[PDB]
Tab-separated table of N, CA and C in Angstrom:
chain	number	residue	atom	x	y	z
A	1	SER	N	-21.800	6.646	33.115
A	1	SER	CA	-20.349	6.726	34.819
A	1	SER	C	-19.360	5.578	34.034
A	2	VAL	N	-18.672	5.415	35.072
A	2	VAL	CA	-17.451	4.509	34.262
A	2	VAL	C	-17.675	3.546	33.445
A	3	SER	N	-18.902	2.568	33.471
A	3	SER	CA	-19.508	1.176	32.875
A	3	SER	C	-18.999	1.745	31.434
A	4	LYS	N	-19.560	3.126	30.954
A	4	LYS	CA	-19.733	3.386	29.489
A	4	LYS	C	-18.437	4.131	29.053
A	5	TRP	N	-17.735	4.369	29.676
A	5	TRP	CA	-16.182	5.247	29.870
A	5	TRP	C	-15.580	4.569	27.968
A	6	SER	N	-15.202	5.301	27.104
A	6	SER	CA	-14.450	4.689	26.021
A	6	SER	C	-13.136	4.943	26.838
A	7	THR	N	-12.077	3.836	25.588
A	7	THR	CA	-10.854	3.527	25.733
A	7	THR	C	-9.954	4.883	26.191
A	8	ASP	N	-10.529	5.747	24.930
A	8	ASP	CA	-9.710	7.297	25.649
A	8	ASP	C	-9.846	8.001	26.982
A	9	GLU	N	-11.067	7.567	26.735
A	9	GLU	CA	-11.888	8.192	28.591
A	9	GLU	C	-10.657	7.512	29.766
A	10	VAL	N	-10.338	6.232	29.804
A	10	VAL	CA	-10.091	5.627	30.459
A	10	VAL	C	-8.675	5.975	30.885
A	11	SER	N	-7.969	6.156	29.853
A	11	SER	CA	-6.210	6.273	29.245
A	11	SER	C	-6.241	7.732	29.828
A	12	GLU	N	-6.876	8.955	29.568
A	12	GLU	CA	-7.137	9.931	30.336
A	12	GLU	C	-7.075	10.163	31.968
A	13	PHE	N	-8.160	9.720	32.527
A	13	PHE	CA	-8.162	9.496	33.254
A	13	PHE	C	-7.300	8.773	34.513
A	14	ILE	N	-6.770	7.785	33.632
A	14	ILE	CA	-5.424	7.068	34.272
A	14	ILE	C	-4.411	8.339	34.483
A	15	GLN	N	-4.078	9.110	33.626
A	15	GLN	CA	-3.343	10.209	33.422
A	15	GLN	C	-3.470	10.846	34.262
A	16	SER	N	-4.935	11.209	34.912
A	16	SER	CA	-5.373	12.328	35.856
A	16	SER	C	-4.786	11.655	37.240
A	17	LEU	N	-4.615	10.847	37.552
A	17	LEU	CA	-3.776	10.240	39.061
A	17	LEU	C	-2.833	11.070	39.210
A	18	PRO	N	-2.246	11.792	40.433
A	18	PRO	CA	-1.343	11.606	41.074
A	18	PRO	C	-0.607	10.529	40.420
A	19	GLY	N	0.902	10.400	40.472
A	19	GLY	CA	2.188	10.096	39.898
A	19	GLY	C	1.738	9.048	38.649
A	20	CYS	N	0.790	9.112	37.535
A	20	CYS	CA	-0.225	8.323	36.947
A	20	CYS	C	0.181	8.536	35.386
A	21	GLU	N	0.908	9.076	35.066
A	21	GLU	CA	0.717	10.276	34.064
A	21	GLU	C	1.271	9.401	32.474
A	22	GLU	N	2.003	8.478	33.135
A	22	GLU	CA	2.689	7.620	31.941
A	22	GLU	C	2.357	6.418	31.807
A	23	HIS	N	1.150	6.313	32.459
A	23	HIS	CA	0.353	4.641	32.065
A	23	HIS	C	-0.592	5.192	30.986
A	24	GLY	N	-0.940	6.246	30.887
A	24	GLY	CA	-2.378	6.590	29.714
A	24	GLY	C	-1.989	6.021	28.374
A	25	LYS	N	-0.868	5.408	28.325
A	25	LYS	CA	-0.570	4.738	26.840
A	25	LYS	C	-0.838	2.949	26.787
A	26	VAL	N	-0.580	2.664	28.193
A	26	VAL	CA	-0.227	0.993	28.340
A	26	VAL	C	-2.007	0.941	28.284
A	27	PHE	N	-2.792	1.831	29.208
A	27	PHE	CA	-4.442	1.116	29.534
A	27	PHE	C	-4.697	1.233	27.867
A	28	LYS	N	-4.533	2.338	27.069
A	28	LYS	CA	-5.117	2.917	25.926
A	28	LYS	C	-4.701	1.429	24.560
A	29	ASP	N	-3.802	1.146	24.744
A	29	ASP	CA	-2.841	-0.017	23.902
A	29	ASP	C	-3.278	-1.192	24.214
A	30	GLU	N	-4.132	-1.399	25.300
A	30	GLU	CA	-4.627	-3.360	25.792
A	30	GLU	C	-5.897	-2.818	25.930
A	31	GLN	N	-6.410	-1.483	25.043
A	31	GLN	CA	-7.871	-1.448	24.687
A	31	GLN	C	-9.072	-1.884	26.170
A	32	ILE	N	-8.222	-1.165	27.082
A	32	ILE	CA	-9.281	-0.732	28.176
A	32	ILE	C	-10.339	-0.183	28.409
A	33	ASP	N	-11.439	0.152	27.741
A	33	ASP	CA	-12.526	1.093	28.064
A	33	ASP	C	-13.101	0.510	29.675
A	34	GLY	N	-13.981	1.403	30.250
A	34	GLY	CA	-14.433	1.545	31.236
A	34	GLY	C	-15.088	0.244	31.706
A	35	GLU	N	-16.128	-0.597	30.724
A	35	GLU	CA	-16.213	-1.792	31.058
A	35	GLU	C	-14.872	-2.779	31.354
A	36	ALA	N	-14.021	-2.621	31.484
A	36	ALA	CA	-12.667	-3.482	30.968
A	36	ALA	C	-12.280	-3.162	32.462
A	37	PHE	N	-12.277	-1.851	32.457
A	37	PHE	CA	-11.550	-0.885	33.848
A	37	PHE	C	-11.929	-1.481	34.836
A	38	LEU	N	-13.372	-2.043	34.786
A	38	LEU	CA	-14.432	-1.979	36.161
A	38	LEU	C	-13.991	-3.954	36.432
A	39	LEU	N	-12.833	-4.388	35.593
A	39	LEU	CA	-13.244	-6.061	35.528
A	39	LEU	C	-11.659	-5.955	36.145
A	40	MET	N	-10.931	-4.939	36.571
A	40	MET	CA	-9.304	-5.307	36.312
A	40	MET	C	-8.820	-5.362	37.463
A	41	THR	N	-8.177	-5.991	38.191
A	41	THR	CA	-7.418	-6.868	39.736
A	41	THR	C	-6.349	-6.258	39.537
A	42	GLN	N	-5.993	-5.978	40.877
A	42	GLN	CA	-4.539	-5.547	41.504
A	42	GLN	C	-3.510	-6.213	40.839
A	43	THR	N	-3.508	-7.636	40.455
A	43	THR	CA	-2.248	-8.400	40.007
A	43	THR	C	-2.588	-8.303	38.156
A	44	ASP	N	-3.909	-7.795	37.697
A	44	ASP	CA	-3.347	-7.468	36.318
A	44	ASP	C	-2.922	-6.238	36.168
A	45	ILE	N	-2.965	-5.068	36.972
A	45	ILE	CA	-2.820	-3.996	37.039
A	45	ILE	C	-0.669	-4.191	37.005
A	46	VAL	N	-0.596	-4.731	38.510
A	46	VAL	CA	1.072	-5.393	38.738
A	46	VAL	C	1.730	-6.230	37.440
A	47	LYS	N	1.153	-7.370	37.160
A	47	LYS	CA	1.655	-8.435	36.590
A	47	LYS	C	1.505	-8.079	35.455
A	48	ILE	N	0.062	-8.007	34.990
A	48	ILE	CA	0.064	-8.010	33.046
A	48	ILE	C	0.651	-6.656	32.759
A	49	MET	N	0.436	-5.951	33.749
A	49	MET	CA	0.280	-3.923	32.824
A	49	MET	C	1.764	-3.825	32.859
A	50	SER	N	2.077	-4.905	33.738
A	50	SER	CA	3.826	-4.061	34.562
A	50	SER	C	3.918	-2.727	34.954
A	51	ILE	N	2.591	-2.410	35.899
A	51	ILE	CA	2.673	-1.062	36.236
A	51	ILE	C	3.585	-1.098	38.121
A	52	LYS	N	3.867	-0.660	38.158
A	52	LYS	CA	4.886	-0.761	40.023
A	52	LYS	C	3.576	-0.042	40.873
A	53	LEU	N	4.218	-0.835	42.247
A	53	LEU	CA	2.910	-1.112	43.649
A	53	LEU	C	2.125	0.083	43.721
A	54	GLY	N	2.818	1.229	43.659
A	54	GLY	CA	2.545	2.620	43.961
A	54	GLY	C	1.301	3.309	43.023
A	55	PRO	N	1.816	3.584	41.919
A	55	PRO	CA	0.581	4.209	41.008
A	55	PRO	C	-0.353	2.483	40.962
A	56	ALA	N	-0.114	1.214	40.735
A	56	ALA	CA	-1.060	0.225	40.726
A	56	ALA	C	-2.249	0.477	41.740
A	57	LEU	N	-1.510	1.038	43.265
A	57	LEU	CA	-2.466	0.848	44.231
A	57	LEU	C	-3.400	2.059	44.161
A	58	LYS	N	-3.208	3.361	43.603
A	58	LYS	CA	-3.750	4.410	43.316
A	58	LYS	C	-4.785	3.853	42.195
A	59	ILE	N	-4.364	3.338	40.819
A	59	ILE	CA	-5.593	2.761	40.042
A	59	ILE	C	-6.072	1.969	40.510
A	60	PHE	N	-6.134	0.617	41.468
A	60	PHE	CA	-6.867	-0.121	41.537
A	60	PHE	C	-8.011	0.238	42.505
A	61	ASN	N	-7.168	1.217	43.672
A	61	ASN	CA	-8.416	1.807	44.565
A	61	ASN	C	-9.226	2.465	43.757
A	62	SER	N	-9.144	3.151	42.356
A	62	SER	CA	-9.941	4.069	42.170
A	62	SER	C	-10.877	2.753	41.584
A	63	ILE	N	-10.624	1.708	40.637
A	63	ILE	CA	-11.552	0.866	40.616
A	63	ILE	C	-12.586	0.746	41.654
A	64	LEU	N	-12.056	0.191	42.884
A	64	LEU	CA	-12.618	-0.633	43.767
A	64	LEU	C	-13.735	0.758	44.140
A	65	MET	N	-13.663	2.218	44.030
A	65	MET	CA	-14.414	2.962	44.263
A	65	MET	C	-15.808	3.027	43.023
A	66	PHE	N	-15.024	3.143	42.476
A	66	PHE	CA	-16.045	2.972	41.144
A	66	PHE	C	-16.903	2.254	40.607
A	67	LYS	N	-16.743	0.806	41.428
A	67	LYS	CA	-17.551	-0.288	41.661
A	67	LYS	C	-18.426	-0.292	42.728
A	68	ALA	N	-17.873	0.546	43.444
A	68	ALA	CA	-19.071	0.158	44.965
A	68	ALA	C	-19.870	1.566	44.558
A	69	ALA	N	-19.503	2.663	43.585
A	69	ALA	CA	-20.514	3.590	43.472
A	69	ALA	C	-22.109	3.160	42.691
A	70	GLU	N	-21.767	1.867	41.891
A	70	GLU	CA	-22.634	0.915	41.284
A	70	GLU	C	-23.850	0.544	41.892
């Protein structure tokens, strides 16, 4: 599941979200593997990763759904 995703697997997933293709690199650069991905907050995405609210909302909502699947 998401918790075992590699750093490449998270970056690929983020690029698969609509309007989020540009953000694969920053996630890979910050070494966001699946375990770290599920710990992220919205503020982490918006402020620390410098991602706009639109794509941040799609990313964060995905985190929330994947955590809810555990």
